[PDB]
Every structure is written in structure tokens, then in C-alpha cells.
Amino acid sequence: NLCPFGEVFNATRFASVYAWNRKRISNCVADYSVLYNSASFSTFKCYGVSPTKLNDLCFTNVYADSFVIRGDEVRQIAPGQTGKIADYNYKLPDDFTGCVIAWNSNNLDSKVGGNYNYLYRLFRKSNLKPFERDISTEIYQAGSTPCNGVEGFNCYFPLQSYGFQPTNGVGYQPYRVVVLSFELLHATVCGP
Amino acid sequence: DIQMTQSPSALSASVGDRVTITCQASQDINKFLNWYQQKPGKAPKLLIYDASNLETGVPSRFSGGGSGTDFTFTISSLQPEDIATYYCHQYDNLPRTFGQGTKVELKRTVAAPSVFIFPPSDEQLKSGTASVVCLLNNFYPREAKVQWKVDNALQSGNSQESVTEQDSKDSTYSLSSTLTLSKADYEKHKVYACEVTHQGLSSPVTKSFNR
Amino acid sequence: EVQLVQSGGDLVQPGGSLRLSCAVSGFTVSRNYMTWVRQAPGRGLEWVSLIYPGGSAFYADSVKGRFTISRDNSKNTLYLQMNSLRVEDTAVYYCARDPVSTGHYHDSDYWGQGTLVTVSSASTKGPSVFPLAPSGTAALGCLVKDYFPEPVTVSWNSGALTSGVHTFPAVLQSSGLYSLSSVVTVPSSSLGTQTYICNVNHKPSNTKVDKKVEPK
Ligand SMILES: *[C@@H]1O[C@H](CO)[C@@H](O)[C@H](O)[C@H]1NC(C)=O
């Protein structure tokens, strides 16, 4: 049983960060070094584990979360970061054990005129908790008056478009991100 | 930080002329550039957001465009109510930064100054210090040269200058040159004179008085 | 409607501390973006800090650590804590909310009335007012000299003049005190037939002067 990371890393479609995907992987064997040695990743940052060992450490289930952000936001997908993404979209715990892997996806995920498909959350009444998801699209009440389903003054659509344009600077081009979270408990994933 | 270089520093034009300001970024900011207008002694206002889109109520004569590093601002036809100081501001790459600003200035015809020299008051003389004054009332352009001469002697370093803002009516400027001296120095001479040189003078002007 | 009010600013000393207030009417502060911006004396605009609606806050690369931004949701008011003040922080200060542009909506940013903040360490002094005597028209004036800190207000003949009078901007001298003057041009016929007197309101020291000018 080889772990199906192929379905995660090489999927034809990803997600907006606000609606980040999780694939739960357990009961399988995987070659982490096949991943670690791939030249196709521009970022591969790990916390609590080295890429060259992963084949040897076992774990009780791994969660693989995935989404799309801009290049200049990849630094927010790390422990202890702040910002719109970490605060209102996808927060990592302080005690994160695992890796953050990103690569430029401009060739796949950009569209002439701007992509309208990928969104991020602009506003929320409070910061997200670690590994929380919020997929509501309720009109945001910024003032003293209920919106009752109508957008306008102090009644804001909570999502903003990334508008990924093929001609964007690398900082503003789309990057695909996979976060591997390793959990230990009783009794799995293991190497060859 | 993403430094923002805005040109020009100073700009003077006539009514109807199209005006193009410029703001370059040291790194890509995509379309996240806002242009602000600040009138003398008042809160700045947002005109162009997202580098091109106009905010509500902004006249159609205002327009801007750009993406990446170079950014362009333009008023197709200058109006008197558009005289202010405009700044560029990025807001997506923290820390947020602004531009130095461009002071739009009206253009009238050449106007020579009316020079008026003011000796010190005897009250201030008994106070311990003397302050001679020279006034260049109503002139254009702003470029003017005040030289203080005491007993036909060029003075340097003992004077300061202050110029008013551009008038709303005649749109001219006025200059004030203050010469500070101790009472012993003022009483230790005789003739005090202010020589003015401006574009609208055939020969240099020289107002004067005696102690 | 929507309104922002700033208050709580005056002269402080190096190493001092000062809190800035910004009451809001129209929208909930705890649920909206907000920033402070610095307008130097007769110079450009400068960003200070921002706070995301939800807690997170971010500061400039100079006020970092020395400054703090906070808010009180009851009174619905914004606060800027400025500690370890330097002279380089002497300026006017504005509180504003970030512009909106979600989906099929767009609105501008709302700004406050601005509050003046001075850091210079100097004793508050009263402006000495000296006359600029006259002698195709003519001119005279008033010299508002030796005062601190900014600002002052001037008005000629209690407001009986509204044209032909120029109040130059204040100039800070090496002695730590600023200075300015205001002149008036009038025909030589009005000599004595019309009143000549300037009024200097100085709120920093609660000192007001009303001096008269005439030929000599
Ligand atoms: C994605 O496809 C490439 C094809 O060359 C393969 O080498 C790689 O292992 C695939 N990714 C995963 C996670 O298996």
C-alpha cells in the first residue's frame, strides 16, 4: 500500500485557500525521499522533522492539506505567522510537526484577464483557530445595521478575488501549497 | 521596504492643460496602488483606487493606469478646484509606504513684487534685539532674490525667509526676509537696505532707510 | 453619518509617552480595518501602523516596538500608544479606515480631522508682538516673535480685514522658539482714518495679544 500522495500533489484541480482541501492518509507506505528530492518544489520547509529521515519515522495518520495562494503569501503558511491568510483563512498551530511545500503554478492556474475562480477571505469577526475552516459567504456586518442578505454600506462580501493574471510578478503569481501534518498516538504511516 | 519614487516634485500648469504624475515602485505591487489628493491644511482624499478605478464622486477628468512598477496619474483638463498635493500609496506589501508628493500649482503671468522695508520697533530695540524686515508683496513666479545690505555692505547668514502659499485670488506669492541683529549691532551702523531681484524687474529694486 | 474625531495630543518630551484617541460614528471599529498615518511638518505623508479586524496589528519600521495600536469596542474608539517619543516623530497624525472593494461594491476611505503632536522639549513661551511701522499704496504689519509651541492664530482688526493681508508660515529658530509675521497693504489716505490692530490667539499658553500699529 503506497500512500496516494499522487492524488494530492498532482491533482488537476486545487482549492481556494478559504476552502482548503484536506486528504487524510493512513494505512499505507510511502517514499518521502521521492518527494523530497523532486526539483519541482520551490519551497519545502519542515518543522519537527527532516525530509531525509521521514522514510524512517512512523506516524499515526498523516493529514495532507492543500490550496492555492500567491507567492508572496507562502511565508504565511508557517507557524506563528500573522496576516489575512493565517488569521482569516488557514492557521497552522504553534506546535506544528510536518512540512510546507509550495511551487509556482502560473502555467496551470493563471488565466488571461485574471482568474475569478480563486478567492480568499477578506474579513472575519475574529481570527481562525488552528486548522479551522470557514466556508460561509454571509454578508459581513461592519456597522450597526443588519444586512439581511443585501450587500452595500457596511455590509460587505467577505471574499476577495486573487485575480491571478499570467503577467503578474512572481510575487503575485499563483503558487500551489501542500501542508503535511504528522500526528502521533497509539498504534499508521512508515517508509519502505 | 518597497520605496515609492514619485515625480515631479513640483508642477505648475495652466487651466485646461493635461497633467501626468508618476509613481514607480521598487518591487511589483500589481494593481494595489492608490492616489490621494490633499488640499493645503486638510485631510487627504482617495481618488484612484486599484491603480485605475475611480472612487465615487471623482470627476471623469481624473484617470490613472499602470501595473507592476511604473504607475501613471493624469488629469485631462486642469480645473482650479484641482489645485492640491497628490501622493501615491501602496498598501498590499507591508509595511505600507507613500510618495513624496506633487504640489500642483497654477500658472499666471509674470508679476513683479511690491517691496516694502520695515525698520525695527523702538520697543524691541529696548528689549535687546533688532529685527529688520523686507516684504515682497504679490509677485510671480516664486523665484526671488533678497539681499540685505547694511551701509552698502552685503550681509550673509543673519537673515531668514518665509513665503506664503499661492493665493486663491490673484494666485501670487509674498516673501518675508527677517534680518536679526543685536541692539549693539543695529545701533553700530546707519543705512539698512533690501535689494530684490525678480523676473519682472528691469533693474534690481532697493528699498532702504536710515537709523 | 460617518465621522472620526482625534484628540489627546500636545507637547511631550524625549522619552515621554502619549496616547491618541479617535472616536468613530457610523461603523463598528472592532469589525473593520484601521490605520494611523503621519503628516510631518510641511512635508510628505508617512504610514505608521494598521490593525486587522480580528486582532493582528502591524507597525512601520521605525515606530516598531516604540509604538502600539489598540481599540476600545464599547466607546468604539481607536487608540495609538506612542512611547519613547523622539523628535523625528513630531508631526500631525490621522486615523483612517481602509478602503473597500469586495464584489460589486466599492467605497472610499474615511479620515479623521487630524491632531497635532510635538516632541521638542522646550518651555512654553508667550509671543512678543512688535509693530511694523509704515511710512502707489503703503504697508505695515505685526511681528509675532519668540513663542512656543505651535500653533498661533492671527486676525487683523478683530476680523475687519479679509484681503490684502498676508500671514507668513512660522519659522522655527535656533533658539527653540518659532516666529511669524503678518502684513497689510493699504493706501496712504487711510492713515489714521481706519483702525490698525492685530490679534494673536495662542492656545498652547492661553496668551492672547491685541496690538495696534500707526506711523511714527
Ligand atoms: C507526480 O507526477 C510525477 C510524474 O513524473 C511523479 O514523478 C510524481 O511522483 C507524482 N507525484 C506524486 C506525489 O507521486
Numbering used by the authors:
A (entry chain A): 334 to 520, 523 to 527
B (entry chain L): 1 to 211
C (entry chain H): 1 to 135, 142 to 222
What's the publication's text?
Here we demonstrate that broadly neutralizing antibodies can be isolated from peripheral blood mononuclear cells of convalescent patients using SARS-CoV-2 receptor binding domains carrying epitope-specific mutations.
Heavy-chain complementarity determining regions (CDRs) form a cleft bordered on one side by two finger-like loops (CDRs H1 and H2), opposite a thumb-like loop (extended CDR H3) between which the saddle of the RBD (residues 470-492) is bound. CDRs L1 and L3 of the light chain also contact the RBD, forming an additional cleft accommodating the side chain of residue Y505, which projects from an adjacent surface of the RBD. The large surface area buried at the interface is at the upper end of what is commonly observed for antibody/antigen interactions, and is likely reflected by the high affinity of GAR05 towards the RBD (540 pM). Two of these involve the light chain epitope centered on Y505, both of which will likely be lost by Omicron mutants Y505H and N501Y.
